[PDB]
Amino acid sequence: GYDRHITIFSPEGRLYQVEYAFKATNQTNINSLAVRGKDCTVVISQKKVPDKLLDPTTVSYIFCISRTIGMVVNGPIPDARNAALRAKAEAAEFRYKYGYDMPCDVLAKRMANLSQIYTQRAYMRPLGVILTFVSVDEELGPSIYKTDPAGYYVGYKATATGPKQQEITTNLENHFKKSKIDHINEESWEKVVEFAITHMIDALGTEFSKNDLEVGVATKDKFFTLSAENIEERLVAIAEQD
Template sequence: MSRTSYDRYLTVFSPEGRLYQVEYAFKAISGSGHTAVAIRGKDTTVVITQRKVADKLIDASTVTHLFGITPTIGCVMTGLTADAHAQVARARREAADFRYKYGYEITPDALSRRLANINQVYTQRAGMRPLGISMIIIGIDPEVGPQCFRLDPAGYFVGFHATAAGQKHQEAMNHLEKKWKKLDNGRGADDPAKAGQSLSRDEVIEMAIEAMSTVHSTDYKPGEVEIGICSSHEDEEETKGLWRIMDEEEIEEHLLAYAEKD
């Protein structure tokens, strides 16, 4: 059988042990034209993504890749928009079921594990197809603090200090790894966890902006990016520990701070 015979079926392995349809789902994420970056620090976790409006007639306020799942958990979706909306709706339903069953809000890692399990089921049944999206979940865990998880169409999830998804995600990951090595040498004594825990709220936001700007070699304007944040920092008075999306004025402040830093 040729390769084309194997990539017609989701549930049939090739002789090399590959599932081509799952690999094509990863290509759908990279081909979406968007990049998302997430970073967590001492008391803050942040996601940033590009805001692209495909047509001048589209209402820009209705275009977003950031979604709230619970009051304390949010996510950035990269890939096929329709699949993203379906996944967000499922995530909200799972979080609501957990709250109803156990009486308290689901934690970011429990939600990530549940959604990853669902994604994995989509890779083993012929009547389904994998969702062409990468989901980065951020939130504040009441016991362990800021959390950041990335889920992929294969059903794999893992926690990150910093991560990226979408177009040019590998370049973004390489940039973040270099930044983390500098943090290790300067602050963390070769311990990535300690290095990340030393990052303040503003440092986390500016590092995310720097990653996006460096990878795309662009100085972004406030309307060209979206930033979602969960922070227990004292500056977050009314929204302490809650998921929220920054408005353009606040984004502009951080863009200016990053520009002046350079």
């Protein structure tokens, strides 16, 4: 019936233009992972370049929002780019309103509350995207926050996303079951990238030729993404470990 077409409750309390925005999060078949060290928070994406004449330098799912803060997206690239342009406008205004740099927690709340608008208006579409933030915050250390099409928002110690996400997350849980810490027990951002990829390759089984990586790294002064030779050092170090 007509209830399925717009953000209006159906007979069992459901919002189908939010549920069909969850199936939109799968469209790329990308999977992604983000993890904290003692000093860093680091985020990983699969990559797929179907065309033989496509540029891999531009199949980008990792975004710097502003100096110390960034995110990864699961769902279609146009809705993902729209999220990244909201998020930079949220953070740029917060330094105007309040005299300090936007914390990841408040940005993940602030984006999750805009998602409450489209989730209530009958005459708007939700975005089809799940977000995951990275930053280093002086109030809390390195941090991760989720967001989804409903505006559900939650802070994380380490997280993974995509159509394979229960497998990546099941093997992350069974690491902290042993270390019993809130972060991967290492100091350099390089060590935690190499751990994250050790769990990414273990999880997703299709051994990563370097094109299947895109990675961002957040640290106290900067969030940045790995250059095509910086990725190569991680890959050689994991190849040297075993």
